[PDB]
Amino acid sequence: TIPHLAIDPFSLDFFDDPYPDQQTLRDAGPVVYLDKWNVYGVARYAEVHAVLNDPTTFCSSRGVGLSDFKKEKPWRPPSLILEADPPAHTRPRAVLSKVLSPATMKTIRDGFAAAADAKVDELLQRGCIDAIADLAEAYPLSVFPDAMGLKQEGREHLLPYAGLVGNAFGPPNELRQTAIERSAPHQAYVNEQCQRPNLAPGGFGACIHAFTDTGEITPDEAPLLVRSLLSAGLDTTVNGIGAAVYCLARFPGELQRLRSDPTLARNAFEEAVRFESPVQTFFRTTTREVELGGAVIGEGEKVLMFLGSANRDPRRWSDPDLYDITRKTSGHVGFGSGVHMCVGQLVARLEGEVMLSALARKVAAIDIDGPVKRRFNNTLRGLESLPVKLTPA
Numbered sequence: 001t002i003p004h005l006a007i008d009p010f011s012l013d014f015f016d017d018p019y020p021d022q023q024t025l026r027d028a029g030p031v032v033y034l035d036k037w038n039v040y041g042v043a044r045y046a047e048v049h050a051v052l053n054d055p056t057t058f059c060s061s062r063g064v065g066l067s068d069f070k071k072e073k074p075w076r077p078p079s080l081i082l083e084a085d086p087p088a089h090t091r092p093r094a095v096l097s098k099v100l101s102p103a104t105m106k107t108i109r110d111g112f113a114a115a116a117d118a119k120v121d122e123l124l125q126r127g128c129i130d131a132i133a134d135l136a137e138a139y140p141l142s143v144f145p146d147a148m149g150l151k152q153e154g155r156e157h158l159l160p161y162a163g164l165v166g167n168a169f170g171p172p173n174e175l176r177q178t179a180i181e182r183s184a185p186h187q188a189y190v191n192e193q194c195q196r197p198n199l200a201p202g203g204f205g206a207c208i209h210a211f212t213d214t215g216e217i218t219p220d221e222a223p224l225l226v227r228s229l230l231s232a233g234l235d236t237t238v239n240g241i242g243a244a245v246y247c248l249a250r251f252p253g254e255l256q257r258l259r260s261d262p263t264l265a266r267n268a269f270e271e272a273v274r275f276e277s278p279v280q281t282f283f284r285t286t287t288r289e290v291e292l293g294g295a296v297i298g299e300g301e302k303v304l305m306f307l308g309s310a311n312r313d314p315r316r317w318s319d320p321d322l323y324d325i326t327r328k329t330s331g332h333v334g335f336g337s338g339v340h341m342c343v344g345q346l347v348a349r350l351e352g353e354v355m356l357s358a359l360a361r362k363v364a365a366i367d368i369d370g371p372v373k374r375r376f377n378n379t380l381r382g383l384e385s386l387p388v389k390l391t392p393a
């Protein structure tokens with residue numbers, strides 16, 4: 001009743017070009033079985049959205065990677081938010097929601113925008129730059145570690161630690177094995193910066209620790225919640241900004257529309273998140289037998305959600321494979337959906353918006369002028385190198 005496929009969604013060939021295989025996964029049926037890894041898969045928008053929005057049946061506390069924490073030991077102490085279910089999820093979620101709240105965004109927006117304008121000014125003096133290292137990486141690194149309250153020393157561990165986290169959600173392939181082999185210095189830095197004395201006053205980390213006296217989290221929970229922001233607070237933003245620049249370089253007509261109305265900047269970034277979904281996949285684990293898309297799935301089964309595929313499902317999107325900066329993007333699942341929907345989405349959108357706004361106002365053309373290189377990760381989609389020439393407006 002359920003089609004069995006041999007597609008490996010964590011193979012380098014898949015990463016290099018996932019879109020044909022994602023169509024094969026969608027068109028095979030609403031629920032597939034992936035024989036390579038012994039997991040169920042859902043690749044259409046409808047089932048991915050349904051799974052995300054049923055946390056009782058499709059839980060997160062047994063891991064949102066391949067590994068089932070009821071069977072294997074987690075590679076690090078589980079996240080108190082990403083790998084918790086309601087009700088244990090609820091109060092830590094509330095703390096991060098308030099720390100990264102609409103009101104917090106007002107306190108950081110002027111500085112984030114000035115830093116974006118300054119970065120584009122700097123890059124326009126160089127002309128030919130690497131839009132990953134020099135822009136997608138450099139700009140979030142210039143604003144987010146400071147907003148966290150991190151010291152200057154050791155920041156080189158942040159992106160390697162995040163890549164390790166992304167690879168560790170995957171199956172036990174070479175990407176995951178090698179990440180864990182190299183992990184010790186990055187984990188040691190990150191865990192140490194989570195302690196209250198190492199977080200500068202007024203930043204995100206200090207604000208998490210300040211919430212330890214409301215009854216929502218205890219002092220011993222705050223280091224792990226800081227760890228969540230050091231895990232997730234950079235690499236997907238890097239990849240999303242790089243994807244947006246890639247899209248503007250590939251679809252010059254959309255750069256021209258963006259230049260003509262810079263207030264499209266926020267939606268241009270949101271469309272880039274839909275189009276080149278920085279988080280491609282997450283897992284859930286069934287807590288009971290469940291019927292999903294006409295399929296019966298037993299208890300204790302891993303279900304792989306293809307978020308990038310759901311964001312390109314023609315059953316939900318018109319011309320899904322077009323980058324359209326005026327698309328109604330509401331409802332895409334690049335940030336998830338439901339109770340775990342990205343608690344840092346306002347930070348990511350702020351960074352993406354103000355960077356795309358600075359490009360819209362300052363740059364006339366973005367031309368790829370070198371070999372584009374892909375960055376491979378079991379969970380993240382993004383580029384390693386994006387050589388571009390920036391022409392000033």
Ligand code: HEM
Nearest residue numbers: 081082232233236237240278334335336340342343344348
């Ligand atoms: C474009 C950038 C980003 C993308 C594409 C993204 C993607 C996602 C997705 C898909 C989830 C859902 C996980 C699930 O359902 O299991 C999520 C959750 C989360 N994200 Fe983001 N994220 C981004 C930026 C950020 C930033 C900037 C931060 C921190 C400042 C952050 C922190 C978190 C946390 C803590 C969670 C867990 C929330 C929960 O479990 O309730 N993310 N993200």
Ligand SMILES: COc1ccc(C(=O)O)cc1O
Nearest residue numbers: 079081082165227228231232
């Ligand atoms: C969506 O990506 C993530 C979200 C949350 C965490 C966490 O450690 O809580 C880690 C991640 O890699």
